[PDB]
Design a protein around this ligand. Structure first.
Ligand SMILES: CC(=O)Nc1cn2cc(-c3cnc(N)c(O[C@@H](C)C(F)(F)F)n3)ccc2n1
Lengths: 1009, 249
């Protein structure tokens, strides 16, 4: 199973410089060899076979080259070491021993399977074992998606192969917002096209003024026309023949391989907003095509290996027998009795009332009781689940009794082959999530706990003389007052109240609902899922339902819509309308909703995997989001199986991912030492240790020359060891920097500063920074230049992560180090003296507004002088997004929406340019309008944010467990009020928190100025 | 306003907690989240939101004098006449210290007990999580030992098989010093299997101990989880009575 730690041996983080290794010769002899920890297996094998001649039966040994080494790894796997260039410290050995063997079997398969096993964090042979027919079926059937994606990738080779590795990083639309287009000179952009001239690799400039909507080929034409002319019959011939070059971003691996308006490419789009010069590089297509090695896919070994009644014919009610539970961890003194709580669920909604077993003593968990449910067997929907738990009951405080769940478990009532459950079943139960007080956990995963040393519940389902199968889909298929009310229901947020009257109204007008397709989620919740006749009618309507926007389709993928037809419809809206841009944007959520799927094989998993295998930017983050969760035993089988099929078919990217995986492992190990054995050591002593360790060739080889897991477009070259340090914070973060090996690194990023943190969960931060990015994208699209800074953040494991460092920035507390309240503005004046002073105050004001609105809406952790940073050019940003939403409701029963970012005198003096009476200025009024528009722009897109948070409910994030946690943004966005009342509310929270300065300025009656 | 089932400015989330795991028929009236009232009825494991809409009150052609008239009518008659199908059986009553000072001192006490208990529970969880991680690590190392012991035993089996004929040969040849070399190696091998077997045995002990330690951590948590919930409800009840006893907006 997965490795406990990232150590060089079991119970030993680092091997000493010299180590004794037990070598088991094929003649049955044993030679204890003293090896250098960093020696290669070539060296160890040569030094062994020299020594082996000083030992009995030496004559029985073949040539040193007829053999390889085998040993037990920390994953408890027997690994054949075919790659003898690997060092002893990097073998992940359990104990220092090596067994000499002759290589047998399929070398190529074993090597690939080892490379997959290393990347996914578990040996692939563990899957061959799995008895579950659903598992073995997923492993074979998913290969169809693999072959399909590889064929589509190798179709238009080499262009289709280049588009896979280097996909266009483009916006979803060529449409340029009004403020963006006005930043252009009469719709024209000034681009710098660079050429690396042979034989000296000398850099030559070419400034070009061209239309923003110029296709990359058109840009090459202007460069080809400027590099020759500044005739006509020749230019036309030259341009047409010379379309054999490509454009690349200087300093990073972003290519312009597809015919999109230049301005639609995010880098160019970003240059216009920033007022920055776009630096592009011209290189021959041949130079790139020849840097693309072949990505061949091989069908694995497991792919080449060796009376039913309908549900509708079953005339009886649903009953389930609870037999017994092996044990429960409860002290008999504190708890009176124990019982089994059960429910029949469709999503998070019960299909009938919950039923309990009788109360029994703690010492004797036996019930032998049939539970009868108020549901007729043919009326069971396809996504029907049994959600159960063992609960404790303790009275003793008057007639007041306290009920607590002890362990929970969920089961699909139908398996992946549409078979209704029958007969006896043993279910190993899961620990109750920290913070969960509800007696049942319907959002929780299905299936038995793989750890069998846990409470095991015994159940029994009915037998109906045969195998009951869910009926086939063909078998299933057998005014203006009202138009205004419907439109009003459809504009309401995903979590707004739907009255029984509104449900009945929606069901009654179900055929007319097709005229407004966006009302579909509201109509689907109006359905009685416990009625086969209502569902059958809903099925015929969803089959012919008109397409919805991909942002609305994502809602039908959360825990509220478990029906496979509803979910199949949702995946199809994504297949035809979701841009690769938005798929990358929402990937965090799209990966998460795979936990909600009833089965391993589904349309969503097939859609995401085909996309990961046809776009390497999606594949990169798809791999890391799945890998970071491989410790989580609720999803590790599902995710490990999905990762195996991705790694098996991703081509050459596996070699690159394994380099990232191994770089991260060394950093995990290095920090574990600093945090454990060396925890009591001083900063100087810890720093001396880091310097010595980072100089070692094993470390140097692994941590230099790989792609950044934050952005694989950035190449991490040689480490800048003099700039690498252990930070002062509590969990020993590492501040690292690498050279950018790109020929043109000077122009984009000469620095690749990253904070490696082993100790805290970075998932919440990663979610917050995603939201800030989406919010900033809403603002820009609406012409609001509120510049946000969503710095890179990636969770790479269990409380392990990367943070992109923001260069030329300081915390408020750093700036304050004189005693003043004018210190901040004085600091900014001294950094932006002269003509560039106005641009700095603008930037500070704009970034300030964005952060003010964003942190308020989200209910982010309290702001302070260490949490708030300012760039040299005035740009303000927040750091440390460990908390959000209602994090203080349980701790302090207080009910008031906090204003995390209170703009004190310091920030006011900056915005009002030092002026006395800061709130009375025209700069403060301007800043208020920014906040107002920003606030309403987010409220107008509330459905998106609610859906993005709803998609994360099963993630395991402490501050996102229920829809009740999401109710906070419904409050901050005043979603149950009018837009005008909501702006009044925001103004009131700003006024209460700032003690005046924010009141009306428009008229309270009509809100006109 | 005086009706037991009428609550005022309580949120949809507050109603949810009140209706959590209640029997069918359980109801309460509150002010609409925005038609100024909302009735919430417990039916088939779900909370049904029915809007109360004139000069008249009703759900549907309104025909009631007050909210109390509309409720009390359906409190004795099934909601089937409107739509089917249950009566308003069980009302959530807004009815279950003397001074603001006595209440305030009790609040401070419960809030202290609660902050203590919640910090303890969180520390028990971190202790639980770490013990869970360590148990997982030990089980993996035992599996690695099992595989290691198998290899070292194959090495004994292999050494035996290959040396049998060679030691027969040397016995005849009077080369006792060579016999002593093969045996010394084989002994080095057996000592090592003994060392590994003992190491696995010692870890198997540690696991049985730590497995029992996890069991007790889980027991401790299952006892303080219900107390933590009630203490928080009490703490929150006192905050409510303090707001009400104090000067209001
Ligand atoms: C020049 C310079 O200092 N630039 C700079 C610093 N910086 C810090 C963070 C960041 C984000 N989130 C955190 N939780 C965190 O925490 C720290 C305490 C630790 F834990 F990593 F040390 N730091 C993000 C961007 C960034 N850019």
């Amino acid at each position: 199973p997965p490795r406990p730690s990232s150590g060089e041996l079991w119970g030993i983080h680092l091997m000493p410089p010299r180590i004794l290794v037990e070598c088991l010769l094929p003649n049955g002899m044993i030679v204890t060899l003293e090896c250098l920890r960093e020696a290669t297996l070539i060296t160890i094998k040569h030094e062994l076979f020299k020594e082996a001649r000083k030992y009995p039966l030496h004559q029985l040994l073949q040539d040193e080259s007829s053999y390889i080494f085998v040993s037990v790894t920390q994953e408890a796997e027997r690994e054949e070491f075919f790659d003898e260039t690997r060092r002893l410290c990097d073998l992940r050995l359990f104990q220092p021993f090596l067994k000499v063997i002759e290589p047998v079997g399929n070398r190529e398969e074993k090597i690939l399977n080892r490379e997959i096993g290393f990347a996914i964090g578990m040996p692939v042979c563990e899957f061959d074992m799995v008895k579950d027919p659903e598992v073995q079926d997923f492993r074979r059937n998913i290969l169809n998606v693999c072959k399909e994606a590889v064929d589509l990738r190798d179709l238009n080779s080499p262009h289709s192969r280049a588009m896979y590795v280097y996909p266009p990083n483009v916006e979803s639309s060529p449409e340029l917002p009004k403020h963006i287009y006005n930043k252009l000179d009469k719709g024209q952009i000034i681009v710098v096209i660079w050429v690396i001239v042979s034989p000296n690799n000398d850099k030559q400039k070419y400034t070009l003024k061209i239309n923003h909507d110029c296709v990359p080929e058109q840009v090459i034409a202007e460069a080809i026309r400027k590099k020759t002319r500044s005739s006509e019959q020749l230019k036309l011939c030259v341009l047409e023949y010379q379309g054999k070059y490509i454009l690349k971003v200087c300093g990073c691996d972003e290519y312009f391989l597809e015919k999109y308006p230049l301005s639609q490419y995010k880098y160019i789009r970003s240059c216009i907003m920033l007022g920055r010069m776009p630096n592009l590089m011209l290189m021959a297509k041949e130079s790139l095509y020849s840097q693309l090695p072949m990505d061949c896919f091989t069908m694995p070994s497991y792919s080449r290996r060796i009376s039913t009644k309908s549900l509708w014919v079953i005339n009886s009610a649903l009953r389930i027998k609870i037999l017994c539970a092996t044990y429960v961890n409860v002290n008999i003194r504190d708890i009176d009795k124990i019982y089994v709580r059960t429910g029949i669920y469709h999503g998070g909604e019960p299909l009938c009332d919950n039923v309990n077993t009788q109360r029994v003593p703690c010492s004797n968990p036996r019930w032998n009781e049939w539970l009868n449910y108020d549901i007729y067997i043919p009326d069971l929907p396809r996504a029907a689940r049994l959600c159960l738990s063992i609960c404790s009951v303790k009275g003793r405080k008057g007639a007041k009794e306290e009920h607590c769940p002890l362990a929970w478990g969920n089961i699909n009532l139908f398996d992946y082959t549409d078979t209704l459950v029958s007969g006896k079943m043993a279910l190993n139960l899961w620990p109750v999530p920290h913070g969960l007080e509800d007696l049942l956990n319907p959002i929780g995963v299905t299936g038995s706990n793989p750890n069998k040393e846990t409470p095991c519940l015994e159940l029994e389902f009915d037998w109906f003389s045969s195998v009951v199968k869910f009926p086939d889909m063909s078998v299933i298929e057998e005014r203006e007052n009202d138009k205004e009310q419907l439109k009003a229901i459809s504009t309401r947020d995903p979590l707004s109240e739907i009255t029984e009257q509104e449900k009945d109204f929606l069901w009654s007008h179900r055929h007319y609902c097709v005229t407004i397709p966006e009302i579909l989620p509201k109509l689907l919740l109006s359905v009685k899922w416990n009625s086969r006749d209502e569902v059958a009618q809903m099925y015929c309507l969803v089959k012919d339902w008109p397409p919805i926007k991909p942002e609305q389709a994502m809602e039908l993928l959360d825990c509220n819509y478990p029906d496979p037809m509803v979910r199949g419809f949702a995946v199809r809206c994504l297949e035809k309308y979701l841009t690769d841009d938005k798929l990358s944007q929402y990937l965090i959520q799209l990966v998460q909703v795979l936990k909600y799927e009833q089965y391993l094989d589904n349309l969503l998993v097939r859609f995401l995997l085909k996309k990961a295998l046809t776009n390497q930017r999606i594949g990169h983050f798809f791999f890391w989001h799945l890998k970071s969760e491989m410790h989580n035993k609720t999803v590790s089988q599902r995710f490990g199986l999905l990762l195996e099929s991705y790694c098996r078919a991703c081509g050459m990217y596996l070699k690159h991912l394994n380099r990232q995986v191994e770089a991260m492992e060394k950093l995990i190990n290095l920090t574990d030492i600093l945090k454990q054995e060396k925890k009591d050591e001083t900063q100087k002593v810890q720093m001396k240790f880091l310097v010595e360790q980072m100089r070692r060739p094993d470390f140097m080889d692994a941590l230099q020359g790989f792609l950044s897991p934050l952005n694989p477009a950035h190449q991490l070259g040689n480490l800048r060891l003099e700039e690498c340090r252990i930070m002062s914070s509590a969990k020993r973060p590492l501040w690292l920097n690498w050279e950018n090996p790109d020929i043109m690194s000077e122009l984009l990023f000469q620095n690749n500063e990253i904070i490696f943190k082993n100790g805290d969960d970075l998932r919440q931060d990663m979610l917050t920074l995603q939201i800030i990015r989406i919010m900033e994208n809403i603002w820009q699209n609406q012409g609001l230049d509120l510049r946000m800074l969503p710095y890179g953040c990636l969770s790479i494991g269990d409380c392990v992560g990367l943070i992109e460092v923001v260069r030329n920035s300081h915390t408020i507390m750093q700036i304050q180090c004189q005693f003043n309240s004018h210190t901040l503005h004085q600091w900014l004046k001294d950094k932006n003296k002269g003509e560039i002073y106005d641009a700095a105050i603008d930037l500070f004001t704009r970034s300030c507004a964005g952060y003010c609105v964003a942190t308020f809406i989200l209910g982010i952790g309290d702001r302070h002088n260490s949490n708030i940073m300012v760039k040299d050019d005035g740009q303000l940003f927040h750091i440390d997004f460990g908390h959000f939403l209602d994090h203080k409701k349980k701790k302090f029963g207080y009910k008031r929406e906090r204003v995390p970012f209170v703009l004190t005198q310091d920030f006011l003096i900056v915005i009002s340019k030092g002026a006395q009476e800061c709130t009375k200025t025209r700069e403060f009024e301007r800043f208020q309008e920014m906040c107002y528009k920003a606030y309403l722009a987010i409220r107008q897109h509330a459905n998106l944010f609610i859906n993005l948070f709803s998609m994360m409910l099963g993630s395991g994030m402490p501050e996102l467990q229920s829809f009740d946690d999401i109710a906070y943004i419904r409050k901050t966005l005043a979603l149950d009020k009018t837009e005008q009342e909501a702006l009044e509310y925001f103004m009131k929270q700003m006024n209460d928190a700032h003690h005046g300065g924010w009141t009306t300025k428009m008229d309270w009656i009509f809100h006109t100025i | 306003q005086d009706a037991e089932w009428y609550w005022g400015d309580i949120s949809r989330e507050e109603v949810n907690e009140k209706l959590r795991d209640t029997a069918d028929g359980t109801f309460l009236v509150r002010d609409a989240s925005t038609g100024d009232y909302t009735l919430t009825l417990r039916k088939g494991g779900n909370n049904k939101l029915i809007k109360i809409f004139d000069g008249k009150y009703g759900f549907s052609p309104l025909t009631f004098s007050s909210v109390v008239e509309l409720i009390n009518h359906y409190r004795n008659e099934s909601l089937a006449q409107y739509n089917p199908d249950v009566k308003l059986l069980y009302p959530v009553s807004k009815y279950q210290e003397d001074n603001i000072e006595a209440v305030g001192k009790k609040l401070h006490e419960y809030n202290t007990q609660f902050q203590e208990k919640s910090r303890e529970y969180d520390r028990l969880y971190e202790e639980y999580t770490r013990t869970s991680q360590e148990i997982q690590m030990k089980r993996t190392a035992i599996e690695a030992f099992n595989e290691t012991i198998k290899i070292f035993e194959e090495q004994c089996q292999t050494q035996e098989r290959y040396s049998k004929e060679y030691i027969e040969k040397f016995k005849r040849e009077g080369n006792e010093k060579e016999i002593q070399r093969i045996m010394h190696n084989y002994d080095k091998l057996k000592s090592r299997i003994s060392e590994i077997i003992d190491s696995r045995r010692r870890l198997e002990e540690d696991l049985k101990k730590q497995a029992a330690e996890y069991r007790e951590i889980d027991k401790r948590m299952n006892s303080i989880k219900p107390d933590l919930i009630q203490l928080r409800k009490t703490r929150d009840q006192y905050l409510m009575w303090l707001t009400q006893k104090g000067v209001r907006q």
